[PDB]
Amino acid sequence: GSARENEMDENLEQVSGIIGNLRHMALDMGNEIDTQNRQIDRIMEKADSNKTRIDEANQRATKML
Amino acid sequence: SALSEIETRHSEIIKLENSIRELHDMFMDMAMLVESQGEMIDRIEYNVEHAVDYVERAV
């Protein structure tokens, strides 16, 4: 019947438009995560480098005793 | 043939709902995942901010 068919058609038109937004959101998400993953990698590296220098400074100091 | 196109159209509707449902479940998983990591980053930010204060006072 045509009230059913028309509604099914508006629903699908509406789903489609929203799938288009979801694609755009998923892509931005992906990019932001790639950028934060690189940033996390620089943080890990810098934290480990920081901890080595902390331990070293302390070990040099412990010779002062 | 009228019934025939409704029957195959119906199958494809169901196939489309399955994918949409899978897509919805990923979008929920992602948000749970990111929210969880929101909380791990709160603690890291806290631990770091205090290590900053420590090192600064000690020098």
Binding site: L12, V15, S16, I19, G20, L22, R23, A26, L27, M29, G30, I33, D34, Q36, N37, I40, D41, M44 | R9, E12, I13, K15, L16, S19, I20, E22, L23, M26, F27, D29, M30, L33, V34, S36, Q37, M40, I41, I44
Partner: peptide, 30 residues
């Protein structure tokens, strides 16, 4: 027009699966 939707959705699915893989990776770095 139905067909353009099935393929459109399965593309986002593929994209969200990669994204979820990156975030399991980001979970491992934290």
């Amino acid at each position: 027009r139905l067909q353009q939707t099935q393929a459109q959705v399965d593309e986002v699915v593929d994209i969200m699966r990669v994204n979820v893989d990156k975030v399991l990776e980001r979970d491992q770095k934290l």
